Amino acid sequence: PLHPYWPQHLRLDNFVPNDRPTWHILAGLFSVTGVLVVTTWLLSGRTWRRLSLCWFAVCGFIHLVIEGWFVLYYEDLLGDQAFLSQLWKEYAKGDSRYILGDNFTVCMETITACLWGPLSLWVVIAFLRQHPLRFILQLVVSVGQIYGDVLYFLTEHRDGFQHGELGHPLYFWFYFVFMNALWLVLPGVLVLDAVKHLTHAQSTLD
Amino acid sequence: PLHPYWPQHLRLDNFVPNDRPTWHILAGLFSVTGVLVVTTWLLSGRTWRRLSLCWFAVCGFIHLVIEGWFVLYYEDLLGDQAFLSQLWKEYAKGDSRYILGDNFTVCMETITACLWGPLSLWVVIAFLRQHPLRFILQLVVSVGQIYGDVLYFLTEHRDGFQHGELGHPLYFWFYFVFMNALWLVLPGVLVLDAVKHLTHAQSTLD
Ligand SMILES: CC/C(=C(\c1ccccc1)c1ccc(OCCN(C)C)cc1)c1ccccc1
Numbered sequence: 493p494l495h496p497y498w499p500q501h502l503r504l505d506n507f508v509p510n511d512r513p514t515w516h517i518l519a520g521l522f523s524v525t526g527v528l529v530v531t532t533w534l535l536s537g538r539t540w541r542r543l544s545l546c547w548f549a550v551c552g553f554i555h556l557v558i559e560g561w562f563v564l565y566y567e568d569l570l571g572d573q574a575f576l577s578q579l580w581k582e583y584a585k586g587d588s589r590y591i592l593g594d595n596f597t598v599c600m601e602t603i604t605a606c607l608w609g610p611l612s613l614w615v616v617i618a619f620l621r622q623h624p625l626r627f628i629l630q631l632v633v634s635v636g637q638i639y640g641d642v643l644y645f646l647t648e649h650r651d652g653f654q655h656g657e658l659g660h661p662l663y664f665w666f667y668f669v670f671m672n673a674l675w676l677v678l679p680g681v682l683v684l685d686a687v688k689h690l691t692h693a694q695s696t697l698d
Numbered sequence: 699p700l701h702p703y704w705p706q707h708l709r710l711d712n713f714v715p716n717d718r719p720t721w722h723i724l725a726g727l728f729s730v731t732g733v734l735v736v737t738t739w740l741l742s743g744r745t746w747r748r749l750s751l752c753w754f755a756v757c758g759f760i761h762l763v764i765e766g767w768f769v770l771y772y773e774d775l776l777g778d779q780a781f782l783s784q785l786w787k788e789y790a791k792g793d794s795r796y797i798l799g800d801n802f803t804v805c806m807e808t809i810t811a812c813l814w815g816p817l818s819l820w821v822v823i824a825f826l827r828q829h830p831l832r833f834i835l836q837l838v839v840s841v842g843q844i845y846g847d848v849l850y851f852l853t854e855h856r857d858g859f860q861h862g863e864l865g866h867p868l869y870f871w872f873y874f875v876f877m878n879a880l881w882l883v884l885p886g887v888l889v890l891d892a893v894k895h896l897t898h899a900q901s902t903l904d
Pocket residue numbers: 517518521522525550554558559579582583641644666667671672675
């Protein structure tokens with residue numbers, strides 16, 4: 493093999509093995525995500541719901557900087573730019589096909605980065621008890637995230653898990669299954685939350 | 699050409715020209731859709747929302763019966779089955795690729811048939827008792843439909859409108875653009891409705 497991308501018949505010229513090791517990307521972003529969680533917990537102070545605000549901040553970050561970075565540079569994917577493009581190449585060492593510039597994958601990433609990022613930051617802004625749209629926004633964003641993620645899983649699945657080595661501990665179970673499963677589980681609860689409160693908002697209107 | 703499907707280099711074996719003309723299916727759908735609109739206007743009476751409710755009923759039909767027929771009986775492509783198969787073959791004479799069994803198209807149709815249909819029926823049925831989940835469900839359904847439709851357009855666009863003859867009056871501008879623009883515009887207005895109502899329902903809690 494001349495490259496890790498696992499549909500092994502892929503003829504990927506113009507491929508450059510990343511200079512920075514995988515632990516560079518994983519650790520540097522875990523660190524920046526912690527920084528955002530702390531900064532947003534403080535700005536919230538200025539219990540669980542105050543955590544959900546940091547969740548929505550980390551969302552807006554991933555959707556805008558990272559998932560948006562893919563939306564722009566899904567054609568180059570050569571490590572001469574910032575380590576974000578290398579991040580995406582490493583995620584592609586995981587299951588999916590973010591190297592080939594998949595028709596569907598580009599579209600779903602474009603939508604989540606254009607809408608759910610801004611709207612997630614609008615959730616964290618409008619949740620400081622300032623606007624009635626706080627749970628409507630939570631509901632819309634989390635429903636959209638659930639849709640995007642379920643379509644991502646279904647599409648890659650109906651391809652028979654073609655892209656990416658099946659069962660791989662690092663690349664399949666963590667990169668593919670776990671990271672994405674977050675935007676399946678966490679916003680699901682949030683939908684229920686946004687539903688359980690908005691139903692109450694509908695009941696008190698009497 | 700041995701088929702109208704416009705990526706004309708498509709070699710489509712095991713293809714059977716529909717026995718029933720197009721007017722068969724057109725009338726068979728006109729009658730039943732009118733029947734549903736009438737029965738639901740009656741059950742609503744027994745102002746505007748009584749129309750929107752039958753809209754949510756007609757949705758429940760198309761998503762469940764028609765789009766469900768597609769989700770099941772691809773890729774047989776035999777007009778010897780019910781007039782649903784001829785319906786889908788005629789729509790595929792239009793732009794999109796409901797002949798090829800497109801990965802994304804099948805996945806999106808699976809989600810809209812499994813989720814948005816039932817949920818639209820839950821809106822129209824549970825909208826009779828003024829239940830508090832009604833504007834939440836209306837919002838969720840219409841947001842999901844908008845997501846499905848935006849991805850439906852975007853993917854074909856990044857495919858360069860490959861499937862289907864561009865600009866064709868019947869097949870592209872009516873079948874492709876208009877029919878989907880329906881589920882882009884009408885549930886958009888419904889999103890706005892449910893949002894302004896839930897904002898008012900959220901404002902009163904003080
Ligand atoms: C720990 C680094 C990381 C990653 C990452 C995970 C594995 C390998 C490489 C990178 C990340 C990247 C994209 C992502 O969205 C994938 C799209 N699917 C959801 C559809 C979710 C997580 C990350 C970056 C910022 C905040 C939190 C995590």
